[PDB]
């Protein structure tokens, strides 16, 4: 399960804001890991920059 992987790799803030984004877009984070990861990376890269 990537649900564990994302917890291991990414920070809390990213997961919080990502889940908030997925919440605002009316979508379940746990039922769609790929999107959560995509948003997590897409959100992380900005902070990395």
């Amino acid at each position: 399960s990537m649900d564990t992987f994302i917890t291991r790799n990414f920070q809390t803030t990213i997961i919080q804001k990502a889940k908030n984004t997925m919440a605002e877009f009316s979508e379940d984070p746990e039922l769609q890991p790929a999107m959560l990861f995509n948003i997590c990376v897409h959100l992380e890269v900005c902070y990395v920059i």
């Binding site: 990537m2 790799n9 790929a34 990376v41 992380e44 890269v45 990395v48 920059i49």
Partner: protein, 48 residues
Amino acid sequence: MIFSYNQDYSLSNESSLDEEGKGRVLSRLTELQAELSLKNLWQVLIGE
């Protein structure tokens, strides 16, 4: 500012992002993609 996992990118402006972040971003992306492909989590991402 377009980036990929396989060290391929496309910047609209050249001077916007200098050569340090460009390294860290591609490094992070490749490292992540590596970690995913390492633990068989890539197929789920590539899959519909």
